[PDB]
Amino acid sequence: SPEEQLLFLYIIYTVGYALSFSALVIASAILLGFRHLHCTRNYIHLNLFASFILRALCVFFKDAALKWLSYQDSLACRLVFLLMQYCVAANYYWLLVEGVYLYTLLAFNIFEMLRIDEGLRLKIYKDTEGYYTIGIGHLLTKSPSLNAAKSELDKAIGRNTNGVITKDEAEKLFNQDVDAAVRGILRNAKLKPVYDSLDAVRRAALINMVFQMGETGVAGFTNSLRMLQQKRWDEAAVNLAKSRWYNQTPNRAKRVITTFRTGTWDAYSEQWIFRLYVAIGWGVPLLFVVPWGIVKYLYEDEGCWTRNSNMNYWLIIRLPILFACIVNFLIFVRVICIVVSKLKANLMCKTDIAFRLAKSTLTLIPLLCTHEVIFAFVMDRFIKLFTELSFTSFQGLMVAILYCFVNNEVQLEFRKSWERWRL
Ligand SMILES: CC1(C)CC([C@@H](Nc2ccc(-n3cnc(C(F)(F)F)c3)nc2)c2ccc(C(=O)NCCC(=O)O)cc2)C1
Ligand SMILES: CCCCCCCC/C=C/CCCCCCCC(=O)OC[C@H](O)CO
């Protein structure tokens, strides 16, 4: 039956957007409700969720206006259609920043953490404590003798120093120092169990402490190390604030303690970057959506602009999205090369956030951009292609699943809350 086919596809479409709307509101409520989920990653998720929620609101509004001049001739319809077009471009560009954030998350590590904290020195300098230092936090000897310090650096670099050391030599010594730090931790009886239980991010935090203080130094934090091994992060944060380390160097200590408490790099992020993300996800759609609306209002205005087959006006809305998908696939490829690298070199386990986040984002990219690339310049089997509506309806539900409901951290929050109710 012809009419029966159209009706049944209508049902699956509307229940797709119903399940998606409900799931996205529930998932955003989870991300906002639990305080431990308040990190930049989940904020980016919340903006993506909002774009999908608004898309669903447009769908329900268009459907609800069918009940009670026809609706195709009104201007309210053209406004709802323009808002929906905006939401679609927002989906694709917040997916773009999702991918960009993932890439930079894979590019940050202990080496960059320490290059921020310790600084770079070109010449020998006598630090406040009496130690001569150079490079990236490379302390030589407390011996108050510039002559002997330059010699001690000469044997530890290979060539004659004279005082000035190039950037390459400093990076070489920096790798040496970081490897010594990890070998120290694994050769310590009070630090190996906790380091082996920590995730890569909190591992880098522990290494940071060892790079500043020392192997036997941080082993003195008996009280904090025990509760770090017990997954009780917040207790250990407040405990680490009551330290000599926190009062001597507070700005570095707060960054490291944040990394322990949350397991993220948020304490090393620049805050204008997130504003550039919001200027991409919400701002750039505004930059090609509204001229399309202007030209469709002045030069192609017939039935809420549904007859979009005349001129270049279809391209000014489809070339930007193609752009956002092209880059999204290039990111898609590059990320893969990185992840399989870091997994093979045992720099990363499949239990870390970078891998799980790639496990979701690498799914969504070819799930949302492959249609746009395949039919790139095609303007316009009927039942079989009407199955695009089912997937575009269930898109937001899948976003809520892959970015909330199967996330391990939120499942932790639910079990922790039930445990609080029992005890
Ligand atoms: C629709 C499906 C049938 C596909 C989906 C599935 N996709 C998926 C699974 C594995 C790899 N993968 C492995 N190795 C590589 C390599 F090569 F390294 F890149 C990629 N890639 C893609 C999926 C499963 C599990 C999750 C998941 O737990 N999310 C929560 C993690 C989080 O948000 O914190 C997400 C997606 C399920
Ligand atoms: C709205 C219209 C519906 C269309 C929706 C169809 C989506 C099906 C995906 C096709 C992938 C094609 C290109 C993907 C590239 C292959 C790479 C790959 O398989 O990924 C490896 C990694 O391990 C895990 O993704």
Side-chain angles (χ1 to χ4, degrees), residues 2 8-34 36-67 69-71 73-114 116-125 127 129-149 151 153 155-158 160-172 174-178 180-186 188-189 191-214 216-253 255-270 272-301 303-305 310-377 383 385 387-417 419-421:
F8 193 77
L9 287 161
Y10 173 86
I11 293 311
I12 56 94
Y13 187 86
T14 49
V15 306
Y17 278 96
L19 269 49
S20 294
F21 182 90
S22 300
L24 289 159
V25 176
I26 287 176
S28 51
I30 295 172
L31 291 190
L32 290 173
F34 300 102
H36 292 77
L37 307 174
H38 286 58
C39 54
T40 63
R41 174 172 47 84
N42 289 340
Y43 291 133
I44 297 172
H45 292 15
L46 287 166
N47 289 257
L48 185 74
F49 295 161
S51 63
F52 278 97
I53 291 177
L54 261 61
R55 184 172 179 175
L57 293 167
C58 291
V59 173
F60 299 129
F61 196 94
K62 181 185 175 278
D63 179 28
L66 301 177
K67 186 164 178 163
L69 299 173
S70 182
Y71 177 67
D73 306 337
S74 66
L75 187 131
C77 175
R78 313 175 192 276
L79 289 182
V80 175
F81 182 55
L82 187 64
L83 186 62
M84 171 128 190
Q85 201 47 269
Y86 180 78
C87 289
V88 170
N91 300 336
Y92 287 92
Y93 276 89
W94 277 105
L95 186 61
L96 177 53
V97 314
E98 195 67 64
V100 175
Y101 173 78
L102 178 64
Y103 183 89
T104 58
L105 195 63
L106 299 163
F108 206 82
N109 54 33
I110 179 65
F111 298 93
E112 312 303 322
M113 187 183 191
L114 284 176
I116 300 301
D117 288 341
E118 295 286 350
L120 179 59
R121 284 191 190 275
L122 206 71
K123 300 173 179 166
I124 301 194
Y125 181 80
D127 206 351
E129 310 82 28
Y131 300 90
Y132 285 94
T133 181
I134 200 170
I136 304 96
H138 188 75
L139 280 63
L140 302 163
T141 49
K142 198 173 185 280
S143 300
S145 50
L146 186 59
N147 191 17
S151 183
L153 183 61
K155 159 67 176 138
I157 190 70
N160 187 13
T161 51
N162 175 33
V164 185
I165 271 73
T166 62
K167 185 169 173 290
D168 283 48
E169 303 182 343
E171 289 286 2
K172 195 199 297 162
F174 183 52
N175 279 54
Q176 297 174 4
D177 299 332
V178 177
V182 298
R183 282 189 296 267
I185 297 168
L186 299 167
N188 189 303
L191 293 177
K192 186 177 80 54
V194 57
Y195 176 88
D196 293 353
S197 62
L198 287 181
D199 47 274
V201 195
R202 290 183 251 259
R203 279 192 185 182
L206 189 54
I207 301 170
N208 192 290
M209 288 177 70
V210 173
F211 198 97
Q212 185 186 19
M213 306 176 69
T216 51
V218 307
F221 292 88
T222 302
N223 203 21
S224 300
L225 296 171
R226 175 62 173 178
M227 41 193 64
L228 281 175
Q229 195 172 346
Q230 296 182 322
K231 311 299 185 188
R232 295 190 300 180
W233 314 117
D234 306 85
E235 192 173 346
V238 67
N239 193 74
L240 280 165
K242 321 169 189 294
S243 298
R244 69 283 189 174
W245 168 57
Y246 181 84
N247 295 35
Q248 184 82 294
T249 52
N251 297 344
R252 185 194 175 114
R255 292 188 287 263
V256 179
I257 296 174
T258 298
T259 304
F260 278 119
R261 184 178 62 81
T262 62
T264 63
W265 300 116
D266 290 10
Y268 289 79
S269 183
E270 291 190 286
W272 64 269
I273 296 294
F274 193 89
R275 302 299 197 86
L276 215 39
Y277 295 156
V278 301
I280 293 178
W282 300 113
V284 171
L286 207 51
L287 194 141
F288 60 93
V289 166
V290 312
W292 169 84
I294 288 169
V295 296
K296 291 291 286 177
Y297 181 72
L298 297 178
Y299 302 93
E300 290 181 25
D301 189 54
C304 316
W305 315 320
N310 184 24
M311 209 189 206
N312 317 18
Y313 308 137
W314 183 80
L315 280 161
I316 60 186
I317 198 82
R318 295 258 81 93
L319 278 173
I321 295 181
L322 188 64
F323 180 79
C325 283
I326 284 174
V327 295
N328 264 332
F329 274 114
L330 299 174
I331 302 311
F332 175 93
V333 172
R334 185 42 48 184
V335 164
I336 296 185
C337 291
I338 303 310
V339 169
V340 309
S341 288
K342 293 178 66 66
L343 287 169
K344 182 156 197 191
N346 262 328
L347 302 179
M348 181 190 298
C349 281
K350 291 197 173 195
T351 193
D352 295 330
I353 35 148
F355 176 80
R356 292 173 297 191
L357 188 60
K359 187 148 63 69
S360 294
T361 300
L362 289 184
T363 301
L364 292 166
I365 294 175
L367 195 83
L368 273 71
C369 264
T370 202
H371 176 277
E372 192 70 33
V373 176
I374 287 171
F375 307 98
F377 293 92
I383 314 175
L385 226 157
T387 64
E388 175 182 10
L389 307 164
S390 63
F391 263 73
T392 56
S393 60
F394 283 91
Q395 278 173 349
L397 166 73
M398 183 141 260
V399 176
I401 301 292
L402 297 182
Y403 278 153
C404 189
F405 296 119
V406 294
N407 178 230
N408 305 20
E409 284 73 20
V410 315
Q411 299 178 345
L412 280 175
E413 294 309 310
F414 284 97
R415 168 45 61 182
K416 194 170 71 180
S417 186
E419 195 71 29
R420 301 289 173 81
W421 182 267

